[PDB]
Design a protein around this ligand. Structure first.
Ligand SMILES: [Cl-]
Ligand SMILES: [Cl-]
Lengths: 315, 309
């Protein structure tokens, strides 16, 4: 079961028990047994029959900007619903100390994975210096504010290892001002959807977060986990793409608003990201897919919420 | 209130403006925060990005109320998580007890209204005194069980022997009437789940019933009230008006069930009851849900519905 990604324009339809994508060249069937989540970068129309069909199969649909920024998601009715786990989730938010621990854990994890990135790329960092701020803090806002500076410095330390063309200077998001900002925005937008998909495969309610504020209109928990997995996946993908030379100036375009990837660039980056998502690890002593890790992080969290195993963030 | 679309067509962006095609009609979304689709509606990427930009949620439904899913845009409007308040009223024992008691109270009263309407001398209210002094949920449920048992046993006075309940039987049923009530209860279960999905309430969190079956426990809580109002009434009219005879039931290897003919008959009667007005029976369910939500945010204390018709 693999992620479906659609750059072309057309219409998703249901011709009975098969799902089709009609374009110029027209009706091509889709094996929906093998489809896990869907990603829409093209201008694509979806019929009610299709959407019903995709919903019936518990498949998520992810929608994106014209320059490939995350737009939104179609979330089908939950299959793995569990009434008690939800209550434990909410109990760890309602209790302030419990919330503080998790909120701190996410930022700790992000900071450590970030400095491991810098350590691996041979940049002297010691972002760890900032952890003292984090762990003695009593309010969530100041915690998040520290995480912001840490991220801000990490980029600026990453720029030392980057050529002027692909240097970050300010993180500029929607919309970018840089080839590198464009790249990172695109990759972060992929990662967000990926984490939402993996959360839908658990009994966790995706709206309840600890670091970020819960909203019934927002998958905030995915934002909580993206703290950890931005460093591990997205940043690495960006770095390898820029440094090995898969992306040149040719794959970027300038308009009045910002800088963006060409369709070619988007496809290159999409494949590299998917290629990292299936790249497997070796814990040098225990002797697993990057995506598996995401779901494992979710399971770690669940074991914490039922008081079984205290939550240590992935490093 | 939010936008709801029963008609069939296609949502489009002509060019910065939202339209419904089939015939081009524009849409004023300025005061709108969520959209509800009950019709067969197609949505263009341009439309969907336009909706996403304004931070509007789209909720999707079959014509018969099958919940499909929700589009959650990236753009977030300021809100709060209702689920947390839901869970807060479970985690707090006193709060849970109040609601748990409310559901059973409601059920008991609607049941007694049923018996009053069918001219059966009841006084189920007698049992409410047990209810309000109880401190554990199991005991509350046991009382509700007693009340249900007696209500059935007095309902039997008004029924012919063929369609008499004797024991409530469920896994599986032993009777044509048990079969009927089980079927109608399942239909009602789905209906209440549908109406719940049209709110922001999480359907798994209940108070009377345990969450930890992990399957729409809240629907069971509200079914306490609406079983009497809808399901039982439909059953009563079906058996006595004579729409269901023995022919519509079958004995199976284990238990008793409706034929496809029977299921269709019962389905039509139930659906027609849902649109019968006093404000239709279906609206009342959603109104109950809104009452519950107003309770959960400390605005209005929750009084259970008691049918006056
Ligand atoms: Cl705070
Ligand atoms: Cl029952």
């Amino acid at each position: 079961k693999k992620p479906l990604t659609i750059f072309s324009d057309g219409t998703l339809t249901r011709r009975e028990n098969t799902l089709y994508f009609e374009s110029a060249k027209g009706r091509k069937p889709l094996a929906i047994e093998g489809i896990y989540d869907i990603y829409i970068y093209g201008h694509v129309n979806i019929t009610s029959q299709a959407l019903h069909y995709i919903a019936q199969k518990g498949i998520l649909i992810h929608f994106f900007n014209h320059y490939g920024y995350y737009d939104g998601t179609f979330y089908p009715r939950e299959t793995l619903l569990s009434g008690d786990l939800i209550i434990r989730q909410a109990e760890h938010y309602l209790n302030k100390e419990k919330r503080l621990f998790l909120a701190k854990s996410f930022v700790t994890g992000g900071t450590k994975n970030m400095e491991r990135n810098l350590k691996n790329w041979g940049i002297k960092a010691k972002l760890s210096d900032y952890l003292d701020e984090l762990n003695d803090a009593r309010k969530i806002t100041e915690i998040m504010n520290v995480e912001a500076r840490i991220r801000q410095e990490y980029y600026a330390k990453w720029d030392e290892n980057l050529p002027e063309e692909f240097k970050i200077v300010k993180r500029t998001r929607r919309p970018p001002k840089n080839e590198m900002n464009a790249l990172i925005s695109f990759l972060n937008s992929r990662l967000y959807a990926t984490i939402i998909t993996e959360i839908y495969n658990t009994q966790l309610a995706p709206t309840i977060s600890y670091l970020h504020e819960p909203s019934e209109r927002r998958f905030s928990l995915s934002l909580d986990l993206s703290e950890i997995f931005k460093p591990i996946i997205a940043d690495r993908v960006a770095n390898r793409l820029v440094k090995k030379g898969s992306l040149k100036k040719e794959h970027f375009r300038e308009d009045l608003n910002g800088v963006l990837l060409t369709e070619e660039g988007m496809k290159i980056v999409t494949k590299a990201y998917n290629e990292e998502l299936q790249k497997s690890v070796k814990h040098p002593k225990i002797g697993v897919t990057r995506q598996r890790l995401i779901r494992l992080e979710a399971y770690k969290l669940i074991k914490h919420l039922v008081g079984v195993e205290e939550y240590k963030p992935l490093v």
